[PDB]
């Protein structure tokens, strides 16, 4: 999934640059650019695969790493139980990230403090 | 249907087993079809070139032919499928290139139908 | 045409050959257009390895006895696993991206490659514990990635049943809850232990049957064909005979199509 | 004979590459139709 | 929770004593629902008074009367009187939500998480896993749906020859439609899986919710011995049978003294 967004991102980086050189080779030029013309075979092509990769019909997975012991696990069998499953139709999205959250690491390589700045809530029912 | 056709037509048969040829006569007798068809339905343009480029696109140079449509067929081998065999396969296939009996090698590899698609093509075939 | 995609099989020896050349021929009947990969360990001897190789697009060879093989180290932790570990090679085909891996000891009896359209471990309801998959056919997609945290959750915790449907369950315990559309109708892969448990069920919906998978101890090809009354060796009851349909399709293709492959390679 | 027969041996796969399958044969059935 | 109920059906008092056994398992594992049997008329007088000890309403349900809903189709599948006595289950418009569980059935933890489920949530089949052990399921009472289910009572019946057949029949979509009408197993455990694929019942019997006791020897049946909670199948765990005939002994005998027999 992430590989994807990777691939996604550096697709549309590489159609972005070919769109700024034909549009500023078009504005050189003195012509609004053709919209339709501006975008070359080849790109089609890339941009196709792209739209490729993306498509899917299995529901993003409820935790990010591979549990060792996952049958086990309280927050996976709570979560199969409640029914989030992150299905299309539903609006709340369970993440489980069993590790700290740190640098070294490829998802959401932002440590503790910045991934809780970035979020938008806390909740810490402790008992 | 068209496996038996193709018997009738060229007195060669392809087995259950080969996927390939099984692939090629389909893909064969369509081809031929679908020129044919052409030139019936279209004014009749006494020149179309039809271009083989392969040993499994041959079964349909080897049907236009015979069903006597008028259209130009060339076919061209990018390899010799009984060479790729012999090669390794025997211990000193350039030289005694004149002396193989082609037909009891082919035989003996269980690649005598393709051996016969590719040597009729290449007879069938004006160039 | 579609290079891309494949049934994978696996034959651990001779007599699991003979499964697979009927498996691969039963998907040539029904008019694949995928390719059909085998995978065998070096018990399969070369004279039957000529015949896999003639029906079966690559047979591409898993030994986990070689130490090169990326398994062998798992194997020197868990020896009683040889067989799962040779299985869980249908991962490496990355080559393919998706494949449908089917036992030797199933028999297509429709065309199934409406399969390719479920994505990652996409496995019918199994008998039994109707929470687990049935690996005898499941749609799966090959990965390095996949496939050596597979060798890892083998090593570290092994398998409940001590085979490929325990090692895969546990890997992947989210289909029997995530999503209804992994799940697999029964009818893609029919075990007759069904038909013999719940006849009634077969009697209704058996008629749609796309896939039988032969359970139990007396695999088809052990059992005795007297073509002239096109009658098995009938035993007591067993669960592959409630239906003298599905086990006379299995005879009657291998007959058919696969003695004169047999014969033709010196079996 | 064997005709009909003959394109069966050809589906199992068995062929009498040697005698009546031989290409020579083929060419005979080829050459019905001319250039 | 006036407006939600676990529901079962007896027929006779041999599956009283399940139902009591049912009832007290629901009780101890502290459901907040009401406990609603159905009893045939075959039910004797003084076990439904036992059965009154445990369960809210005993509901009498009697095919044979002719002012009974069912008893048309009854003429016309006369094999099907259990049958058409549990599906009264869809009667009790009382309720807004059910959970029906068979007389045969024992629970071992809290489930008011099956009022979750919506219409038809039931635990896959051991055997075809396409159809819908009845032993569990949810559902949401309804006059319409009950005259639905006669209709194809009298029209084609069951595949099985009972409920399951005519349940699966009607309720088709479950097999294909929802993953959340397709309750886990655990909330269905028939032994015969635990038995036939025990290697699963070991990794996942621990978390079992509720035993269902399908075989040819019934959990009333079993021989019990109080000496060491003994019983002389299926039942391959014989620690759920042990459950079984304890409760019973515990908190139904009393009960049971107490009203007769």
């Given at each position: 999934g992430q590989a994807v967004r990777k691939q996604l991102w550096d697709t549309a980086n590489t159609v972005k640059e070919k769109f700024g050189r034909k549009l500023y080779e078009s504005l050189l030029v003195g012509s609004l650019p053709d919209m339709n013309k501006m975008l070359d075979k080849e790109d089609f092509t890339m941009m196709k695969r792209a739209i490729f990769a993306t498509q899917r019909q299995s529901f993003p997975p409820v935790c990010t790493h591979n549990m060792l012991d996952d049958s086990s696990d309280p927050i996976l069998t709570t979560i199969r139980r409640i029914g989030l499953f992150n299905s299309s139709a539903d609006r709340v999205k369970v993440i489980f990230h069993?590790?700290?959250?740190?640098?070294?690491?490829?998802?959401?390589?932002?440590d503790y403090e910045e991934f809780v700045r970035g979020c938008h809530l806390g909740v810490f029912p402790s008992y | 249907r068209w496996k038996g056709e193709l018997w009738d037509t060229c007195n060669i048969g392809v087995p259950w087993y080969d996927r390939e040829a099984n692939d090629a006569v389909l893909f064969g007798f369509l081809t031929t079809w679908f020129l044919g068809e052409f030139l019936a339905q279209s004014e009749e343009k006494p020149h179309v070139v039809a271009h083989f480029h392969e040993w499994l696109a041959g079964v349909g140079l080897c049907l236009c032919r015979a069903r006597r449509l008028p259209v130009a067929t060339i076919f061209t081998t990018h390899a010799t499928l009984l060479g790729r065999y012999l090669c390794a396969g025997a211990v000193d296939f350039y030289n005694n290139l004149e002396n193989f009996n082609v037909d009891k090698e082919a035989g003996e590899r269980q690649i005598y139908h393709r051996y016969c698609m590719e040597r009729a093509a290449a007879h069938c075939a004006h160039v | 045409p579609m290079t891309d995609q494949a049934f994978v099989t696996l034959t651990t020896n001779d007599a699991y050959a003979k499964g697979a050349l009927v498996l691969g021929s039963s998907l040539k009947q029904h008019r694949t257009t995928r390719r059909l990969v085998v995978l065998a360990t070096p018990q399969v001897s070369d004279s039957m390895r000529k015949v896999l190789e003639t029906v079966f697009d690559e047979v591409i060879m898993v030994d986990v006895l070689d130490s090169g093989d990326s398994a062998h180290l798992t194997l020197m932790k868990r020896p009683e696993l040889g067989v799962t570990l040779t299985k869980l090679?249908?991962?490496?085909?990355?080559?393919?991206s998706k494949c449908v891996f089917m036992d030797a000891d199933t028999l297509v009896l429709?065309?199934?490659?409406?399969?390719?359209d479920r994505e990652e471990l996409?496995?019918?309801?199994?008998?039994?514990?109707?929470?687990?998959?049935?690996?005898?056919v499941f749609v799966y997609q090959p990965s390095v990635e996949t496939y050596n945290q597979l060798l890892h959750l083998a090593s570290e915790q092994g398998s409940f049943d001590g085979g490929d449907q325990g090692i895969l369950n546990t890997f992947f315990s989210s289909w029997a809850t995530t999503d209804?559309?992994?799940?697999?109708?029964?009818?893609?892969?029919?075990?007759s232990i069904s038909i013999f448990s719940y006849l009634p069920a077969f009697k209704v919906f058996g008629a749609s049957a796309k896939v039988v998978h032969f359970l139990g101890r007396v695999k088809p090809w052990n059992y005795t064909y007297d073509p002239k009354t096109k009658?098995?060796?009938?035993?007591?009851?067993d669960p592959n005979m409630t239906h003298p349909e599905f086990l006379i399709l299995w005879w009657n293709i291998f007959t058919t199509n696969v003695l004169p492959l047999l014969q033709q390679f010196g079996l | 004979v064997s005709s009909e027969e003959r394109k069966e041996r050809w589906e199992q796969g068995q062929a009498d590459y040697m005698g009546a399958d031989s290409f020579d044969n083929i060419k005979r059935k080829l050459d019905t139709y001319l250039q």
């Amino acid at each position: 999934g992430q590989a994807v967004r990777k691939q996604l991102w550096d697709t549309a980086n590489t159609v972005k640059e070919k769109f700024g050189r034909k549009l500023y080779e078009s504005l050189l030029v003195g012509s609004l650019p053709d919209m339709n013309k501006m975008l070359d075979k080849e790109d089609f092509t890339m941009m196709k695969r792209a739209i490729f990769a993306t498509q899917r019909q299995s529901f993003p997975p409820v935790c990010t790493h591979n549990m060792l012991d996952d049958s086990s696990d309280p927050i996976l069998t709570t979560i199969r139980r409640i029914g989030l499953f992150n299905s299309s139709a539903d609006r709340v999205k369970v993440i489980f990230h069993p590790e700290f959250l740190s640098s070294t690491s490829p998802l959401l390589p932002v440590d503790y403090e910045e991934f809780v700045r970035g979020c938008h809530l806390g909740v810490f029912p402790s008992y | 249907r068209w496996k038996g056709e193709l018997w009738d037509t060229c007195n060669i048969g392809v087995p259950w087993y080969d996927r390939e040829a099984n692939d090629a006569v389909l893909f064969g007798f369509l081809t031929t079809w679908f020129l044919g068809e052409f030139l019936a339905q279209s004014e009749e343009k006494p020149h179309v070139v039809a271009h083989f480029h392969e040993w499994l696109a041959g079964v349909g140079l080897c049907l236009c032919r015979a069903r006597r449509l008028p259209v130009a067929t060339i076919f061209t081998t990018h390899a010799t499928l009984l060479g790729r065999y012999l090669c390794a396969g025997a211990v000193d296939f350039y030289n005694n290139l004149e002396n193989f009996n082609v037909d009891k090698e082919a035989g003996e590899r269980q690649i005598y139908h393709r051996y016969c698609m590719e040597r009729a093509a290449a007879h069938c075939a004006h160039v | 045409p579609m290079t891309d995609q494949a049934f994978v099989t696996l034959t651990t020896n001779d007599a699991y050959a003979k499964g697979a050349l009927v498996l691969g021929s039963s998907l040539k009947q029904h008019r694949t257009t995928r390719r059909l990969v085998v995978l065998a360990t070096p018990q399969v001897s070369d004279s039957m390895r000529k015949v896999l190789e003639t029906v079966f697009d690559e047979v591409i060879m898993v030994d986990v006895l070689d130490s090169g093989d990326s398994a062998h180290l798992t194997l020197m932790k868990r020896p009683e696993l040889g067989v799962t570990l040779t299985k869980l090679h249908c991962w490496s085909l990355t080559q393919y991206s998706k494949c449908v891996f089917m036992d030797a000891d199933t028999l297509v009896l429709a065309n199934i490659d409406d399969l390719f359209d479920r994505e990652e471990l996409s496995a019918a309801p199994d008998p039994g514990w109707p929470d687990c998959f049935n690996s005898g056919v499941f749609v799966y997609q090959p990965s390095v990635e996949t496939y050596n945290q597979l060798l890892h959750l083998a090593s570290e915790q092994g398998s409940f049943d001590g085979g490929d449907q325990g090692i895969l369950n546990t890997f992947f315990s989210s289909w029997a809850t995530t999503d209804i559309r992994k799940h697999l109708p029964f009818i893609y892969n029919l075990s007759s232990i069904s038909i013999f448990s719940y006849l009634p069920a077969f009697k209704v919906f058996g008629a749609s049957a796309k896939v039988v998978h032969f359970l139990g101890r007396v695999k088809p090809w052990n059992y005795t064909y007297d073509p002239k009354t096109k009658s098995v060796k009938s035993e007591a009851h067993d669960p592959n005979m409630t239906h003298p349909e599905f086990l006379i399709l299995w005879w009657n293709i291998f007959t058919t199509n696969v003695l004169p492959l047999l014969q033709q390679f010196g079996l | 004979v064997s005709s009909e027969e003959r394109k069966e041996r050809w589906e199992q796969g068995q062929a009498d590459y040697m005698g009546a399958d031989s290409f020579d044969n083929i060419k005979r059935k080829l050459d019905t139709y001319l250039q």
